[PDB]
Symmetry: C3
Subunit: 95 residues, 3 copies
């Protein structure tokens, strides 16, 4: 599994969120952040199976790219385990 | 060492924080975030020795689980080094 | 590449940000967080080439260290890929 962390322009949040839900993303975490003066951005984090990473990356790029400066970046970070707090299920069972 | 990132319901913050302090957690970072409409959640991050990961995971699960939807998830991410800014100490010496 | 995540005192933000820009950091993400009562802190994230990690760590330590309690910590986390949303460039080309 991998954590996908994307820093995007605030106004692109609803479009990226919808596009991700369309391709089957079960959950996501959003944080208000600042970046580059410091400009407001939105950080999205989703953790997915290794085999779903590329589709997610493509979708975020297609949806948030405007062609102008400050569109953001996407980081792929390794995740060694995921645990669902409600059930205690782990790994694939916890998504 | 591993970074443990848990996304929980806001109201469970004081209980999880206390339970973690009880099992010896020296420090933690908390961020206000939104997730799943977007609902408010609390993100907790602690970085601990490999041998302390499971105890921390169990404690968070026991403390934040309500059995209802949206209890959250816990991600275990690898950390290659930790540096204490005040002293410059690293690794085990920086916790 | 590696993600460098540093939790610092709020007042040190402008100095650390400037010092990092001086050593060639192209971008950074800042989040308002709380840590240790919970005290306000600032989280900085930069993702850099493996060979630039130590210089960045040194710079953050030199700039944010006051010698007092609560100066913070720096975590080095592995990043398997970086994608620039504006162009779709990856890895070294996406910084
Ligand atoms: Cl991370």
């Amino acid at each position: 599994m991998k954590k996908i962390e994307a820093i995007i322009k605030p106004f692109k949040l609803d479009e990226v969120k919808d596009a991700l839900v369309e391709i089957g993303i079960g959950g996501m975490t959003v944080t208000e952040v600042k970046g580059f003066d410091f400009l407001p951005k939105v950080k999205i984090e989703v953790v997915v199976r290794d085999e779903d990473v590329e589709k997610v990356v493509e979708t975020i790029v297609k949806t948030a790219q405007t062609g102008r400066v400050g569109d953001g970046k996407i980081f792929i970070i390794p995740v060694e385990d995921v645990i669902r707090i409600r059930t205690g299920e782990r790994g694939e069972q916890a998504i």
